[PDB]
Symmetry: C4
Subunit: 329 residues, 4 copies
């Protein structure tokens, strides 16, 4: 029973230091990123901010707006094959900016397979388990890789670099990083297992990039600054659920105006459809109705352009290279 001597930090524990540059204004900043993935060998270009594949936020209506801003949507796994066919028919321009989501079960794999065959324009797969450290997940990734050699594979979640390497070597292109921090995640309270989001991203990013692989910082961001910190720590993408919750484009009706936001393995999800899809049985919360998601997007992108300006990054690419954190109280 060892205690790690190293203190692990989250986003609230740090700030980014401003640095000298020739960038006056935030509009000068290019947030678009180009990635060539390790295993799929595919090339991606866009603003690497991903809507999480949760029931309320990972929707086709959200994708349609996100895609307008060159942003990415991981679509929740509970849409039917027909729903995807309709989306492809009506929103072909978005298909480059979505991922189809699957658990490690036989049925999920079948359903996903059918969607991918029916919609060849979808080139991203998002794989999620309760235990991303399992040998059974490693072998599921190997299988999906072999079944879809040209699809880009997102796989999670982990918080440590050895499992990043193993999953990348096993066929995943992009590793989803985060266990505990998620707004409705409850691992810490229900299992005492987890990891601070910053330190997770810091360590895992190193490990991924040593293999020419990529990571998603998955969860923990409560504001655009955290999104900026995630990127500064080395995250190739940033995945957000809570910050996108509560908008008009979110699934659900308005309930003080509120929208319901619930974990992917929540009791609500369990009743609606998910047992060990995520590491914990997530919370169900009522979030304040934020209105149209446009305005939230603009605030996130704008704040990230400002961060880049202030650290001297003309491109989001350069952020990590120019990110220096200070520890605060």
């Amino acid at each position: 029973p060892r205690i790690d001597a190293d203190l692990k930090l989250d986003f609230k524990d740090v700030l980014l230091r401003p640095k000298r540059s020739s960038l006056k204004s935030r509009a000068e900043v290019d947030l678009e990123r180009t990635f060539t993935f390790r295993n799929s060998k595919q090339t991606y270009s866009g603003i690497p901010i991903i809507v999480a594949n949760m029931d309320t936020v990972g929707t086709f209506e959200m994708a349609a707006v996100m895609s307008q801003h060159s942003m990415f949507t991981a679509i929740h796994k509970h849409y039917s094959l027909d729903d995807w066919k309709l989306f492809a028919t009506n929103h072909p321009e978005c298909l480059q900016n979505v991922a189809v989501s699957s658990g490690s079960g036989q049925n999920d794999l079948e359903k996903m397979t059918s969607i991918l065959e029916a919609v060849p324009q979808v080139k991203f797969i998002c794989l999620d388990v309760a235990n991303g450290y399992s040998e059974h997940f490693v072998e599921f990734v190997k299988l999906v890789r072999a079944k879809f050699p040209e699809h880009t594979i997102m796989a999670g979640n982990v918080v440590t670099g050895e499992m990043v390497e193993e999953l990348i070597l096993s066929g995943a292109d992009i590793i989803k990083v985060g266990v505990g921090p998620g707004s409705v995640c409850t691992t810490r309270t229900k299992t005492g297992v987890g990891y601070p989001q910053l330190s997770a991203v810091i360590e895992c990013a190193d490990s991924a990039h040593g293999l020419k692989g990529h990571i998603i910082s998955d969860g923990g961001c409560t504001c655009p600054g955290d999104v900026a910190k995630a990127f500064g720590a080395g995250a190739d993408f940033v995945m957000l659920g809570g910050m996108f919750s509560g908008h008009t484009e979110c699934a659900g009706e308005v309930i003080r105006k509120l929208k319901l936001f619930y974990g992917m393995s929540s009791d609500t999800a369990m009743n609606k459809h998910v047992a060990e899809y995520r590491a914990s049985e997530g919370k169900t919360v009522e979030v304040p109705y934020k209105g149209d998601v446009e305005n939230t997007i603009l605030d996130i992108l704008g704040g990230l352009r400002s961060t880049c300006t202030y650290v001297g990054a003309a491109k989001l690419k350069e952020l990590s290279r120019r990110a220096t954190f200070i520890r605060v109280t």
Copy 2:
């Protein structure tokens, strides 16, 4: 007046790191543990989570439910001989999963003696004092050991390894660890004496296991994760009061729906029935949680998940595979 340079952590200061394993699902995990005790030489098998011997939670009704899940109940010391006789008559299947509780007083010892002679199926004794570091307690343990050489003895409470050794060498099989962190304990506020629960368990577990003895992490767990951290830190058992408070099976009626939960040495206990525990405990109104079944399932479920995530197929393996990280 020295200050210890080492910072002592509680559960909220740490997390458990996940580790690579071949365990997909939490249902795979075996929470049952088999212990052979050092002094009693008895063997126990069950899920080593214990309901604290407090008035509201350490009840026969609670024990009847706990025993169905192979879990243990330390029965509060205020039940009569007749009440035990009735419980033995009606719930013989439970007797292997309960402990009879006693203070260090002559009257307590006599009453416990009568209960154990009347109910030979009860093979666990729980002893509790205000000052678990006193020589008087050491001698009382020696006496109880001598009086009941084949009963397994739980004795507390302490927070440091030297006293763990002393109590084990004096005849206790299992040492109850924790002074301060208890939900209704008030030692820190009233005496300024105490110890963080994680650091207590870390140090005390080593000390006990060096003698082939055992410990109970007693108090401080506010959620199943803490229960998991306790086990990861080396606790052989984990004892819970606050987390079992507020249920239908708890002593008391419903009072917002609430149940009353009070310290073993509280003013409420003193009026209802002095230095049983290290502090005069709090009396709190806790939210009515409903049936305890659901709570048990949450605790066990979360602990199975923990074990899955660190690669422990059995609860035995937890501490071996527990690596903690310090957090803010």
Copy 3:
């Protein structure tokens, strides 16, 4: 502008470790202490817990109860000479357990002088200034010492050992230690000057005892545990205001039932009568009505007996010797 590398702790930051002993029960513990003062050469015996010389708590009615428990009362400086005469007439058994209080003003010195000459049984003087680090205070101590060679002199406040030494060498017997922690003190908010109470007492106690002098831990205790930690850190006496506030014996009527409790240099005290008596213009608070102080005394003494039991101290004298602190979160 240097930052001290050593983190300074308060009471909340530590716990006392229990230790092996032959003490079963708390009733076995003797809280009485016997002190022989350095400069006055007087001897004191009692339970070295002092009611602070504040308007509401440092009263004759309070002293009459405290004396029954062999405890001390520092009487506020706003009682008249006649009030003292009457208290000597009616409560002669208390006079050994009270101190007369004075500021460093000429009028305060005269009034105190008249009280001490009229009541020769009062053998303790309590001196207080806004700036206990002042050469002006050093010289006032010298003067009081010379005027009253056989009276025991409490002087404050400080938080550091070099001033402890200077004040003792100047003729004070007992140094009041604490600047900031007081329940209605506001130095931190109003001046940013202060010192954590535990670290104050640790460093100051050493410094005092090196000269065969004594200290009072003045302020910061919110509960009997803190009182125990004060003593554990080396405090010869412990002085309490907030903990004694709110009782039937306290000056004021009942106002939820409440009693008013206000700083010695508060706006309330300024209007009632102080300017630079204490380091900050103190708060005025409404405290919950606690009832009769007997009960509070019993809780304080009882908890301190328990502490001594748990560390193996049969006498309060032995506490610091047997006090080991652990740092907590």
Copy 4:
């Protein structure tokens, strides 16, 4: 992506240690400070506490009070030329105690130029950008210096000493230090960029004084203790917005909700400011809009600030505010 090993502290993390001295009473302390600026070569005398150039606090009505106490007011940049002319007409005694404010835009520079030409008695300029680390701001400072060689230039905001040096070498006399801590600043939340205010001042004061330059601690003070701490850490001036917010002298009428008197206080680059006025990238973040409790007349707040800083100086042994930093020793605390 490096993490700085050094923990950076804010005001809450420290206390000032009292020290032995001959000063009994706080009235003995002289808070007035004399500065001779590096680039402007001007000499200033006063109590080096500045009202921030925000909409509600940096007013002419506030300046007229502040000046009475030899205190300084940075006037917000949205006053007209005529408004300044009227202020000069009516309050000539204050003009030495105010600064005219400008962003780095062409229109701001021209308006400020007109004000300075019309009011020659105003000898302080306050320059503020979103990114004080920009080469475009360095250049703007060089141009203002050249345009007004005898005016004293305030320029910000930064948090690090290399930018202090650059800005001073480029012609600013006084560097405004602080990014993050401001009451209605939101950089940390919106951008994740920022710096603790104490560590800012410590580092940046050293850097400025090495050049015989000066700094303002801009933002973060929530009480007079913080103000004292700022000065203790090396700040030549201390600039305050939230602490002056909510008074009778402040722009705006009293608000009345739920048995509560309040005044509105908003960021210089807030949505409120954007709607009311050319503030887009004036400051590093789009600032908050808050309702602050009505505090009454500012006189009383001033007296609390000055009184508490006199006390601080007494307790550390500083007979002059000048001596504070020399006699400031901080201790690290927990709460």
